[PDB]
């Protein structure tokens, strides 16, 4: 009946992909010279948080950044001179995410209270509270000065209107908790990796799912667009990373090693898209090669689990945070 009808389409989808596999990415990029050896050293260390850190977002100016911690603070730093600029106290001590507006006027926050809060930096006080989700917030990203996309643990995502606090549209289709999301460079599509080991490509204007990828074997923790915008990468807690192509609609390469068994908490790309930086549970960060899947560096300056990772817009520095309440700038 209906159940058997869905099975027939699944075979048709799989068959169509198999006809387009002319070759593999590893074969094509065999003749290009390797990147070599990459070594990075800590330039700055930021102190002041009383507890572990989960969130961190760079500024558009590539100089200011924000961070969140369970002690209930939202501190804005100055990476150049190492000077604290702001310190916003939160009503709820369980914060799981944070974001920084493209214009630098607002900062968002959220966590186990099922609410997203917006703060007015240039006025600091709470400006808006958004409610309606039935699960803990996992991520939030600013579309523009008046729109924001959030994902929660009720297996749904939504798009908000800060002026009136109403869900413009709702995205459904996942069967597990949504763990992360990332916006396209042009801000028309975004992807979300959930706990059902699947990632979907949504349309902001229309509000419908377009493509689905089901490569991983366990919970998906991180996701990030390629700088071009035609690909993305994910990281699960089975110590594997995969690169998916939207146009070919299939996985291209896998990044794994035989000496790693810990989970992956965060991923990010480089300015040119050649390097792939991923954070792990073994207290250190690894640097991969996107075109060859070969390790090229290790960042081993942290004494606890690494929870967040980010690269500046100009590609000048990499910031990492960990559970020992310290941030570090690597260059």
């Amino acid at each position: 009946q209906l159940r058997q009808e869905a099975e027939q389409l699944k075979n048709q989808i799989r068959d169509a992909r198999k006809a387009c596999a002319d070759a593999t990415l590893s074969q094509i990029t065999n003749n290009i010279d390797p990147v070599g050896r990459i070594q990075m050293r800590t330039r700055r260390t930021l102190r002041g948080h009383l507890a572990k850190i989960y969130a961190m977002h760079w500024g558009t100016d590539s100089r200011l950044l924000v961070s969140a911690s369970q002690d209930g603070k939202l501190i804005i730093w100055d990476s150049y001179t190492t000077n604290k600029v702001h310190a916003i106290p939160l009503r709820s001590s369980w914060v799981m995410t944070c974001a920084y507006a493209p214009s630098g006027n607002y900062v968002a926050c959220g966590g186990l209270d099922n609410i997203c809060s917006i703060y007015n930096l240039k006025t600091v006080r709470v400006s808006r509270e958004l409610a309606g989700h039935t699960g803990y917030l996992s991520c939030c990203r600013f579309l523009d000065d008046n729109q924001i996309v959030t994902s929660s643990g009720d297996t749904t995502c939504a798009l908000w209107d800060i002026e009136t606090g109403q869900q413009t549209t709702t995205f459904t289709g996942h069967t597990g908790d949504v763990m992360s999301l990332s916006l396209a460079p042009d801000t028309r599509l975004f992807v979300s990796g959930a706990c059902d080991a699947s990632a979907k490509l949504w349309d902001v204007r229309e509000g419908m799912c377009r493509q689905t990828f089901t490569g991983h074997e366990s919970d998906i923790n991180a996701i990030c667009f390629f700088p071009n915008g035609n690909a993305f990468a994910t990281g699960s807690d089975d110590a594997t990373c995969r690169l998916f192509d939207l146009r070919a609609d299939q996985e291209l390469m896998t990044y794994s090693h035989d000496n790693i068994i810990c989970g992956i908490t965060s991923v990010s790309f480089s300015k040119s898209g050649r390097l792939l930086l991923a954070g792990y549970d073994d207290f250190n960060c690894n640097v991969w090669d996107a075109l060859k899947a070969d390790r090229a560096g290790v960042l081993a300056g942290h004494d606890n689990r690494v929870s967040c990772l980010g690269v500046t817009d100009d590609g000048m520095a990499v910031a990492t945070g960990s559970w020992d309440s310290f941030l570090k700038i690597w260059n």
Binding site: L2, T29, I32, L275, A317
Partner: protein
Amino acid sequence: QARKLVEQLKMEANIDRIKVSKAAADLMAYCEAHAKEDPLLTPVPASENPFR
């Protein structure tokens, strides 16, 4: 519920797909073209490095 899943899969089945070779070539071309302005790949002199 069952009807909605059937309708969704039909939409995903009718998608034009290009060869893997084309996508790999495009990615390689983009990386080769933009490898010049990658401060993390080639280290920058300390004069133009704000952190050192």
